[PDB]
Amino acid sequence: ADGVGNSSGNWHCDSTWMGDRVTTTSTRTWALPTYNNHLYKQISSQSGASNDNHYFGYSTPWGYFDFNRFHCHFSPRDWQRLINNNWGFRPKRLNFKLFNIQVKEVTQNDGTTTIANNLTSTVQVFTDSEYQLPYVLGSAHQGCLPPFPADVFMVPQYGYLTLNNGSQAVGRSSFYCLEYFPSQMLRTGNNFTFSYTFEDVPFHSSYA
Amino acid sequence: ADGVGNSSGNWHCDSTWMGDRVTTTSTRTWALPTYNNHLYKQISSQSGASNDNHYFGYSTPWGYFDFNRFHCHFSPRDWQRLINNNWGFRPKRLNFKLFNIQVKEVTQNDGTTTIANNLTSTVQVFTDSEYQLPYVLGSAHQGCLPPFPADVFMVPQYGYLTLNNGSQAVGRSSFYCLEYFPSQMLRTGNNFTFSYTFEDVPFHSSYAHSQSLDRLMNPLIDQYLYYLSRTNTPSGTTTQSRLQFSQAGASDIRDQSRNWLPGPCYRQQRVSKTSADNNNSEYSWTGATKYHLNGRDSLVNPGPAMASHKDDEEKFFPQSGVLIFGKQGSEKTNVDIEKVMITDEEEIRTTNPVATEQYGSVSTNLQRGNTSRQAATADVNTQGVLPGMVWQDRDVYLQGPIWAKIPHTDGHFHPSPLMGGFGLKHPPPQILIKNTPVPANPSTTFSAAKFASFITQYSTGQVSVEIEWELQKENSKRWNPEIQYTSNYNKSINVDFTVDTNGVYSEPRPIGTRYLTRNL
Amino acid sequence: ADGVGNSSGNWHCDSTWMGDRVTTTSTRTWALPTYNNHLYKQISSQSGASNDNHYFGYSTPWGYFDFNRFHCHFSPRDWQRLINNNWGFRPKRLNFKLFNIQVKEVTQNDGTTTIANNLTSTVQVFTDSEYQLPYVLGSAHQGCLPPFPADVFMVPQYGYLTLNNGSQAVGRSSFYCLEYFPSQMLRTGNNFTFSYTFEDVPFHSSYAHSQSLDRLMNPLIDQYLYYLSRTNTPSGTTTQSRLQFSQAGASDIRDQSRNWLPGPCYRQQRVSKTSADNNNSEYSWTGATKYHLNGRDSLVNPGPAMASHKDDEEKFFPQSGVLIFGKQGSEKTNVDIEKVMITDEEEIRTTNPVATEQYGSVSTNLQRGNTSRQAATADVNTQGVLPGMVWQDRDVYLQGPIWAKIPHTDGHFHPSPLMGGFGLKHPPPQILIKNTPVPANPSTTFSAAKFASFITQYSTGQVSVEIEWELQKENSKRWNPEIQYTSNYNKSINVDFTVDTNGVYSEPRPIGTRYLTRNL
C-alpha cells in the first residue's frame, strides 16, 4: 500500500467527550519477536506437581494484542472525569489498526549484533472473529498496552490449555494450528484494520 | 506489481463445506536453492549396477511444486469429516498461487555466512500445461507440501529419465531444455497464478461393501437351477458311476449358480508382521512378484488391488502388495517393521481375491472311466480380466497420492493408478520454478567461454493450493450404527496428529476412506 | 378405492406384436402367508458346516414378487415367434399392478379350520426404487410367476445375507428393517401400481454365427504374408537347421495370419451324459472349477460363456458350465440325469473356446541349437481377456433368467450376467409385500411387553406384469432355409408345453434363442 518510505498510519492518542459518549483512542509502539523458533510445542505441567497444578496444552509461535484493561484507553484524568460525573458506562464499538510495520533482521557475527531492515518480509495478522480458538483474553494476563502512551511493549506469546488427565492428554483434547486460519500478510507499507461492535450490556454501576 | 514493501498475497489455509462440495485451501512457505549450479547434467546408473537398476536421464537446475498427497489439502479433522459421512469424492478444479517472493543473496567471506536481500533478482515460473515434459508427479516422490501448515519445505529438484541401453543412451532418447519454454519472471512484488479444471473422473469408493460377492442370494429360497452334486452311487459292495443333480440352497450355499466373478489377481508372497513366523532366508527379491519388460525385472508394488488378508489373519500382508508409509523420523534404508505403518486393504475382500492366495481352480485334463483318468485341478495364481468380473480399486489414504497421469498409449484397461487415486489423462500440470542465474564479476576482456561464476542465491516465498472437491452423500438405509473413524478417548502422553514437546508434527497411523457401508 | 364388492382390476394376460415391438402382459393369482410370525429373525449357517458354506444374514417377515424368468411373460408360441424371426431383443419398460386384494382370517377351534373374510385388514406394499435393500433377485431363486397363467403361486419369503466371519457377524454387517421404508397400505378395494423404464442395454444375440472365427478368409486367394513353415532341411544323411517361410492358402489354412482371437476361457471338467463313460469316483467338488474369495471356495457355475462341446461330442457337457433345469416333478437333492434337462451352448463355438478344453498353447522356454534346447509348449487352461478378443455371451432360455443387478463396484468388465440375460445398473426394483399384523385380544391391564399373539391370516390377490420388448428384425441374405424351432409332427400321448390328464403344466425341454444365423 505504501511500499518503503510512505507511512501507512498516524499517531491518534486522545479522547473526545460528546454528550452521552466518550471516544478514547490510544496508540502504542509494539515489538514482536520470533516465538518458539517458528514451532508449535506441546506443553504440560512438570512431573511431581500437585494434582491441582496439573495441566496440558500447546504453545504457539504467534503473539496476540491485548487491550483488556481500562488504563490502555483512559488516562487518569479521563478516569476522574468519567467516575466523578457518570452513574454508569459501557462500551459500544471499537476500531483497531496495525500500521508502520517494520521487519528487522538480526545477525550475530564474531560477537557483534547487527540489525538491518528487511523490506520484503511479512507479518501475518488475523482476528478470531468466529471464536474458534481458545479465548485466553480475560484471564488477567500481562502484556497489555502500557498505560503510558510513551512506553514500548512486547507482544505476549499466545498459548492455550486443553483437557488433561494429570500431565497427559485425553482423546477429547483439542489441537489448534493458527496457520489453518486465513491471515493477512503485511510488508513494510501495508496496514491492518478491523471494526467491532459490542453487544448490548448493562451499564456498569459506577455509584455507591 | 508490488515492488519492494507491498505484499502480493495473503495466507489462505482453511476449508469450506457447502452441500455436496468441500473447498480445501493450503498455504506453505517454501525455500528454493540453486540446483546443479544452474547447469543441466546428464545422469545415468553407476557402472556395476544390475541390469534391472540401469537407467539414463538428465538432471535439470529447475525445481517443481508437488501437492499430490491428500495431507497437503486435508487436515486430519477434515479427513475424518470426509470419510465418516460421504460415499465418494473426486476433485473438480484447483487454483495455484506463488507470492511474497524474496530472493536472498548468500556470501561467505573469511568463514562468515552473510545473507542479504536481492530486490532485483527474479525467479522463473511456468506450468507445463501442454504436457511436453516427462511427468514425474505421481511416482510417490518426497518433497510435497508438508501436512502441517506451519512447516517450511524445500522445493524438490526436477529430473527425468529417458530410454537407456544399459548405462548408455539410444538414438530415441529425448533431451529437454526447460528454458526452451515460455516462463514468467517474478521479482520481489510479483506473483504467479493459474487455474486448472479436473476432467470427469469416477468418485472414489469411500465405502466398504456390507455384502460378499459369494453371498448375494436369498438364503430362504432354493434355486431352480441344478448343479452336479454327486458323481457315483454305492453299487453292491463297490461303487458305480452315476451322475446326480441337486438344487442349491443355504446348506450347500457354495454350489449356488452366480452371475459374477471376483476381480483379477496377481499373486503376492505372504509375509507376517510377527518376525519368527517368516522364513529364515533372504527372499525380498527371489520370492518377489515381478513383471518383465525389455529384459529387466521390476517389482510389482503395490500392483493390482487385492485384499491384504482373509478373515482373522490381520498379521499377514502381501510382500509388495500394500502401501507402506514411514513413521516420523524413519530412515531410508532397512528400517524395522515398528518404524513403518503398513496399510490394510481388507475392506475389498468382499469382491477382490486375497493377494497371497490363488484366484481359484480350473480343470487340467479330461476325466474318463474304464484306462481311467481322475479329474485334476490346478491353482490359478494369475488371472486376467474375464467377462462378468467385478472388483474394487485400491483405497486412498491421507498420506497417499491423489492422482497420476495416464500414460499416452494406444490401449489401457481401467486406468486407475495402482498406488491409489484418480487416473487423469490431463492431470494438474507440473509447475517448474528456478532462480535466474546472476553472473558474478566478469572479466574486462571478452571471453567466449560460457559463464561459470555466479552469485550464490536462493529464494523463499509462499505457495497456495485451493482444490474444490465434489462429494457423493451417503444414502444408506441400514438400521444399526456404522463403523466410523474416531480418536481414542483414553489418556495419552501425546495427542494424535499434533506436535510433540519438540513441536514435531507426526501422523500416527494411515487413515483410509472406507468406513461407511453400501450393499453390492 | 373400491371398498367391498367393487373390483379394482381386470385380468390382462396377452401379447401384442407391433412392428419392432412386442408387449407381453401376464396376470397370476398369488397367495401370501404370514412369514416368521411377523418377526425379523437373525439367521446363520449351522454349527459344523464347512467354511465355504458359512453365512450370516437376516430373515424378514416380508415377501417379494419375482418375475425374473422369460416363461413369466412369454408363452411357448410367443417364444417360438420371437426366436424364429428376430436377430435380437431387449426390454424397454414394464408396468406392475396388484389388485383384487383379499385378506382372509384363519381360525382353528376344536380341530376345525374356518376361513372368513377380513375386510378391514391391510397389506403393505412398497418398491425398493432407490436400491437400498440387498438385491436378492437375479440369483435364480424359486417363487416366480408360474409359466402357466392358470397356476396359483405362493409369494416367496424375503431374506438377505450380510458379512460373516464364520457363523458370526462382524461390525460391518448391515441390518435392514423393511418397516423403515414408506409403504402403501391396501385394504380390499385398493390397488397398487408402478411403472419402470429399463436402461439402454445391448440386444441379446438371438442368433448363431454361420462362420467360424478361424475360417473368415477367402479360400481361393493366398495371403501375401509369410509364416515360418519349416525349421530344418535334409543335409547329407542328417538334418541341418534352416528357416523357411510360406504364404498361407487353403491347404495350410491353419497357419493363416488372423486379426482376432477366441474369447476368454476358464476350463471346466468334462462329464458325459452316458454314465459308464465317467470316472468311478466322487469328483463333483475335487474336480470342480472354483474361485477363491476370502478363504472360501465357491463353485464357478455356469461361469464364463463357453461352448459345451466340440463337433460330434453332444454327449459331453462341462461339469458346472451349463444351466441345468429340472423337469416337472423333479426333487431337490440328488436327482438322476433323466430328471433334469441340460442346456447346450454349442452355437457359440464359432468364437468361444470349448469349456472342457484348453484355450491354446504358449511357449515356455527359448529354443537354441548347439547344449541344444528344444522348443516347449504348455496348455493355457485359463486365459484372461486379450486385445483383439471376440466372444458371444451365454444364451437366454424360456425358463432362464431375464436380468440381474450389476454389483455397485469401482470396476467391472462386460457386465453381462454369467447365468444369462441383461446386466442392469438399475434393474426392476424389488416389490415387497407383507400382511399387516393384527393383534389378538389384549390384556385389560397394561403390559410393556411387545405383542406376541396375533390373528392368523393370509392374503390372496392378482398380480399383473406388462413388459414392452424391442425387436431387432432379421435382415439376412442367405439363400438356403435356416434352422427354426418347431414342434414335432409325430403323434404323442401328450402335446408339448400343455397340461396332462392331471392338468399339470410341464416344459419338456429348454428352448434357447439362437436359431437364425448371421455372418461374423
Swiss-Prot record, chains B, C:
MF-aspect GO terms: structural molecule activity
GO biological process, one term: virion attachment to host cell
Entry keyword annotation includes S-adenosyl-L-methionine: no
One GO CC term on file: host cell nucleolus
Keywords carried by this UniProt record: Capsid protein, Clathrin-mediated endocytosis of virus by host, Host nucleus, Host-virus interaction, T=1 icosahedral capsid protein, Viral attachment to host cell, Viral penetration into host cytoplasm, Viral penetration via permeabilization of host membrane, Virion, Virus endocytosis by host, Virus entry into host cell
Domain of life: Viruses
Cellular compartment(s): Virion; Host nucleus, Host nucleolus
Biotechnology: AAV capsids serve as viral gene transfer vectors that have been shown to affect long-term gene expression and disease correction with low toxicity in animal models, and are well tolerated in human clinical trials.
Endoplasmic reticulum among keywords: no
Function: Capsid protein self-assembles to form an icosahedral capsid with a T=1 symmetry, about 22 nm in diameter, and consisting of 60 copies of three size variants of the capsid protein VP1, VP2 and VP3 which differ in their N-terminus. The capsid encapsulates the genomic ssDNA. Binds to host cell heparan sulfate and uses host ITGA5-ITGB1 as coreceptor on the cell surface to provide virion attachment to target cell. This attachment induces virion internalization predominantly through clathrin-dependent endocytosis.
Family: Belongs to the parvoviridae capsid protein family.
Extra information: The ratio at which VP1, VP2 and VP3 proteins are synthesized in vivo is about 1:1:10, which is the same as in the mature virus particle.
Swiss-Prot/TrEMBL domain comment: The N-terminus of VP1 is sequestered within the mature capsid. It contains a phospholipase A2-like region and putative nuclear localization signals.
Descriptive protein name: Capsid protein VP1
Organism: Adeno-associated virus 2 (isolate Srivastava/1982) (AAV-2)
Lineage: Viruses, Monodnaviria, Shotokuvirae, Cossaviricota, Quintoviricetes
